[PDB]
């Protein structure tokens, strides 16, 4: 292997490189392992050790040199790429740039010389290894010098500290190329993803002229004049950071002037909201809300009782008028620009309701001071220069109205950061209380920590507070890899630029590094109390301080591997208590999102149903009563609301809740749940809604080509499935072990074919195949094989039978038992976002016309979260029945169709059933199962395995089949009277045996047989002879005497093995 091994050079434009060395590397390591040990350990090997030891030393030498280029090439690649295409950064550090360029050219030459040499380790020798180590040390020095330069840049711009060093380096390298820089500002800022640009003079150059900014959701804010990108990357980005604010400030002055004008003005509120931006609109709503409330308090000091009731009335009319606007078709950006307003105007209405009920008639009551108030006033006696520090020009002007934000003795200016229409959380009495705690912490210049259980989303509340203020909010997540140095940089960066720091999973931090954080934070907090413009940190003392900065840490008491915070740190951070958000207040918003006028009253009713439903219904895993299920029920109700707005809300909601929950609910729970629904809307009468076109075509297709009886219960399930597939991309057809779950989805496809166009379906069993092999994994050799799921996803898009060309609806069927390990790989597809994740990292997007159908017996292995993710459908065994099989078997329509259109050529021919014979079998089947309680009684008949009703019928049919073919010629020769006895007899014999086999187990098998013998002995007109078991007798057509089974007297054989000898 080694005497002849090699390393091909792969050009990196322009350096030959060692790529794929690791494959050789691993083989070399394996040779070193066994080879070195065997020579010393082996006695024979000890004699010839003078050979193995020399070879082992050579193998050992190879590894050091091999690790050495890898440690240099990767790091050399990075530092070289910092120098590459950076004249700006080249001129800045000439001493190192030149030293580095020297090393790179040497490295490019040495690698070319090696591609001429054979084994790299043999070529490396020792002197070469020492030279490589020296070059690597020289390159490191360049990295250290570059790191110092980055810190100076980090001091200049606060956003750079938050940005990753790899991104930072990229931005500094491409300082000329503006559009590439603007790409990474999405990571720094809450909004402002990129910038719009004027097409340049020469097409080769990238644009500098910024006309507008683009949000993360593509909302455009146009700048007043052209924004030119100046030289230094930090210098033009800091001018941009200020130009964001300036432009938001400049529009608000226009927005508030037009805000007063729309009130009395002919132009509606809802139309004015459209014109302006989601952030500015929402602020200006809150501003004219506070003015409005302030005019209502001043009137009530006059004595007008109606002042509070009219302010209530007005706020409740705008809420309704806006609710109609979300219902009528809008643009998805305009949805939240309008729905975020719905979530603040609902709270506003709840505030004025609360003021009228408590009867608070004084301004500067706590109740008014408590609420987050927004004031647009040029206060001529400005205290704002004392309360915080004046930063921006407009704050210092004192001739133009500034935006101030007052709440319980904490007044700080609206900083104008751009958030770009991220969804505002639903306001609730807990979040109002939470805002009080955090604001008081800032008022006292100390940290504010909210502690709650998992799923509370406390981090999201603290973010949405800073969003209302318009200060930037940064989110940090700690995986216990955080160091003193890495943490210090964040705090240093955060202090430099006014920015709220929220720490996710702060609880899971090493008690060592935490005791630093406490000292670092203490030094900042100590500076804020002094209120000094500049302060001195432990290292890198001279840093710009800003009063507007605040530190928020989110602890989880219940989290596993929790570390107790030091008493010194606990005293600094004010603890707040956090509870799960009330299901009424979230549901109320979701209902107002879909445009229900009575949403409030319905929400309190809706939540109460679900809460009562969990308690009174039997605990089922397939039932989802979570918020995620509620939204998916409302979204369906919302489309139906938009269809018929003129219909009242309470009757519409009634019909929606019943329709969608009925399928999931079992028969035991269907009766109670229907009666439970009656409690909420007793006067309202629900009318069942069924699509007549879909129901007709399903019934017609099932008789024509499926050869199965279109039973009113069966067809209802198919229609219910078809609805679920339309709303929900992913669906679970759950059910009992023996039903027609498979037939229901199969019938739907053949109906879609008759309805529209042919619908390909790719059936697989996920549980059967190994979880790794199904999804597909890397082999020993560096090559990726396509998974069974993964290839169907490539095949269904194009270049296969399932290709999306002529097929309106395709869906891949899965019929395995759901598992948390197996579903975890598919959990990305389960979610609303149609994204597929693989080990190869090949990106596949699920089409809107693609669906997933899972078919499971028990959802016990599945997680409660997994049930929420998708739309469930339960099929009750009794509702389908076994009659439709029996009717399909007696008609032979099912069987006849399968023979006509299958690749199964070698299929046994089923006997022709006489009209007289059919009418006996039909009566006999029906008469023996319905009338006999004793047959289905657990006590009377003891089974070994829990056989399903359907399974026993399938065996009767297959036994009866063979008995007819053998005696078909005899049944025609016989008279109809003795034939009618003979066909009954055939059934009894077949029935006996079809339930006979399953009978067994217990202490004695004989006792369980005798019990079963007794009940079956009453087999209508036909009787069995006494002192014999029903099994021991078989019906003879010629004799008609039920002649007992004749056994052949054993014959001696010369077989040596005893197991071969058969009696």
């Amino acid at each position: 292997w080694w005497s002849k091994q090699v390393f091909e050079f792969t050009e990196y434009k322009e350096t030959k490189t060692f790529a794929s060395l690791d494959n050789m590397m691993e083989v070399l390591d394996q040779h070193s392992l066994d080879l070195m040990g065997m020579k010393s350990q082996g006695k024979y090997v000890e004699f010839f050790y003078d050979r193995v030891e020399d070879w082992r030393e050579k193998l050992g030498r190879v590894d050091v040199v091999v690790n050495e280029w890898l440690k240099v090439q990767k790091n050399w690649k990075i530092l070289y790429n910092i120098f590459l295409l950076s004249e700006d950064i080249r001129m800045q550090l000439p001493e190192d740039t030149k030293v580095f360029e020297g090393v790179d050219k040497e490295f490019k030459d040495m690698m070319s010389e090696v591609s001429a040499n054979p084994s790299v380790v043999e070529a490396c020798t020792i002197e070469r290894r020492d030279v490589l180590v020296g070059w690597s040390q020289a390159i490191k020095k360049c990295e250290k010098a570059l790191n110092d330069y980055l810190e100076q840049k980090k001091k200049s711009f606060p956003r750079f500290y938050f940005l990753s060093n790899q991104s930072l380096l990229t931005i500094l390298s491409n300082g000329q190329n503006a559009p590439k820089v603007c790409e990474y500002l999405g990571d720094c800022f809450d909004g402002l993803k990129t910038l719009t640009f004027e097409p340049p003079a020469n097409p080769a150059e990238t644009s500098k002229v910024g006309i507008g900014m683009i949000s993360k959701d593509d909302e455009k804010v146009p700048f007043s004049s052209k924004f030119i990108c100046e030289g230094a990357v930090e210098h033009w980005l800091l001018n941009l950071e200020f130009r964001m604010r300036e432009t938001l400030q400049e529009i608000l002055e226009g927005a508030k002037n037009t805000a007063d004008l729309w009130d009395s003005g002919d132009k509606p509120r809802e139309e004015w909201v459209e014109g302006y931006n989601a952030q500015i609109a929402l602020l200006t709503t809150t501003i004219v809300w506070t003015e409005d409330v302030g005019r209502a308090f001043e009137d009530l000091a006059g004595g007008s009782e109606t002042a509070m009731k009219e302010c209530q009335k007005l706020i409740e009319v705008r809420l309704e008028n806006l609710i109609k606007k979300v219902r009528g078709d809008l643009h998805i950006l305009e949805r939240w620009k309008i729905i975020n307003i719905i979530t603040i105007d609902v709270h506003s209405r709840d505030v004025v309701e609360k003021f009228v009920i408590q009867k608070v008639s004084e301004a500067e009551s706590f109740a008014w001071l408590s609420q987050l108030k927004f004031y647009w006033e040029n206060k001529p006696d400005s205290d704002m220069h004392l309360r915080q520090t004046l930063r921006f020009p407009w704050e210092k002007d004192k001739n133009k109205n500034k935006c101030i934000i007052r709440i319980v003795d904490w007044f700080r200016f609206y900083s104008y950061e751009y958030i770009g229409n991220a969804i505002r959380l639903v306001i609730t009495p807990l979040t109002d209380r939470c805002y009080i705690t955090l604001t008081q912490a800032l008022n006292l210049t100390m940290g504010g920590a909210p502690a709650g259980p998992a799923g509370t989303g406390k981090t999201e509340t603290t973010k949405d507070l800073g969003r209302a203020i318009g200060i930037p909010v940064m989110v940090f997540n700690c995986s216990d890899q955080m160091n003193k140095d890495s943490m210090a940089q964040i705090f240093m960066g955060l202090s430099q630029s006014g920015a709220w720091g929220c720490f996710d999973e702060f609880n899971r931090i090493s008690i060592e590094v935490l005791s630093v954080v406490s000292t670092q934070v203490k030094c900042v907090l100590d500076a804020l109390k002094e209120k000094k413009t500049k302060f001195s940190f432990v290292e890198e003392g001279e840093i710009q301080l800003q009063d507007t900065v605040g530190f928020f840490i989110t602890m989880n008491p219940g989290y596993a591997g929790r570390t107790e915070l030091p008493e010194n740190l606990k005293a600094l951070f004010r603890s707040c208590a956090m509870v799960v958000p009330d299901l009424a207040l979230i549901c109320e918003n979701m209902l107002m999102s879909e445009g229900f006028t009575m949403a409030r009253v319905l929400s309190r009713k809706f939540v109460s149903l679900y809460m009562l439903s969990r308690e009174l219904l039997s605990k089922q895993k397939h039932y989802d009563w979570g918020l995620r299920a509620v939204k998916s029920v409302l979204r369906q109700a919302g489309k139906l609301k938009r269809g018929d707005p003129d219909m009242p809300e309470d009757p519409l909601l009634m019909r929606a809740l019943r329709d969608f929950n009925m399928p999931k609910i079992v028969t035991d729970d269907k009766v109670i749940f229907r009666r439970l629904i009656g409690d909420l809307f007793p006067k309202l009468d629900p009318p069942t809604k069924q699509n007549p076109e879909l129901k007709k075509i399903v019934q017609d297709t099932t008789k024509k080509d499926m050869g199965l009886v279109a039973e009113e219960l069966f067809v209802t399930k198919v229609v219910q499935l078809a609805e679920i597939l339309e709303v929900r991309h992913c669906c679970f057809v759950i059910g009992p072990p023996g039903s027609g779950k498979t037939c229901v989805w199969k019938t739907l496809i053949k109906s879609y074919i008759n309805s529209g166009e042919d619908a390909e379906y790719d059936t697989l069993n996920p549980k059967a195949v190994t979880s790794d092999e199904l999804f597909g994994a890397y082999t020993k050799t560096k090559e990726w094989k396509n998974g069974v799921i993964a290839v169907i996803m490539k095949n269904q898009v194009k270049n296969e039978e399932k290709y999306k060309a002529t097929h309106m609806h395709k869906w891949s069927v899965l019929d395995g038992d759901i598992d948390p390990e197996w579903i975890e790989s598919l959990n990305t597809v389960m979610d609303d976002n149609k994204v597929l994740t693989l080990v190869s990292n090949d990106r596949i997007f699920l089409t809107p016309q693609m669906r997933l159908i899972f078919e499971i017996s028990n959802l016990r292995n599945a997680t409660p979260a997994t049930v929420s993710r998708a739309g469930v459908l339960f099929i009750n065994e009794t509702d389908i029945g076994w009659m439709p099989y029996m009717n399909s078997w007696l008609e032979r329509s099912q069987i006849n169709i399968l023979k006509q259109q299958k690749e199964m050529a070698n299929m046994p021919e089923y006997p022709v059933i006489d009209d007289v014979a059919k009418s006996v079998f039909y009566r006999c089947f029906q008469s023996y199962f319905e009338q006999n309680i004793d047959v289905h009684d657990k006590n009377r008949v003891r089974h070994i395995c829990p056989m399903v009703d359907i399974a026993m019928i399938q065996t009767i049919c297959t036994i009866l089949d063979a008995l007819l073919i053998q005696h078909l010629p005899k049944l025609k020769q016989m008279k109809e009277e003795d034939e009618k006895q003979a066909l009954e007899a055939f059934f009894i014999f077949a029935g006996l045996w079809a339930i006979g086999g399953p009978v067994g187990g217990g202490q004695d098998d004989s006792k369980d047989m005798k019990e079963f013998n007794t009940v079956w002995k009453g087999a209508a007109k036909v009787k069995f002879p006494e002192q014999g078991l029903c099994y021991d007798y078989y019906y003879d057509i010629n004799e008609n005497k039920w002649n007992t089974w004749k056994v052949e007297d054993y014959l001696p054989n010369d077989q040596p093995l005893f197991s071969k000898i058969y009696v």
């Binding site: 549980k767 190994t770 829990p946 187990g1001």
Partner: protein, 97 residues
Amino acid sequence: MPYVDKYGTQSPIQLLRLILDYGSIFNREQLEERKFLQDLLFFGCLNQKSGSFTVDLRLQRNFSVFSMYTPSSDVIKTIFGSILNAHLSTIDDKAQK
């Protein structure tokens, strides 16, 4: 008797179900190929109180169940009595009883 996982469902058994209904088996080499299987029959032999007590009810539905009963005086005497009588008759005319 095939090893059951945490989840209480056997991977080798679940495969047989895919074969019985759909009649297509995905080969671990060339997973794109359907590899349809035809004119196949499967004859189960299941021992209770052994490994997994019960198999999946969706497979067990496709199979027609049958039971062998535990040994009986009348069953034993007819089986073994006929073996011994055929061998003891060759030994001696006596000692048949």
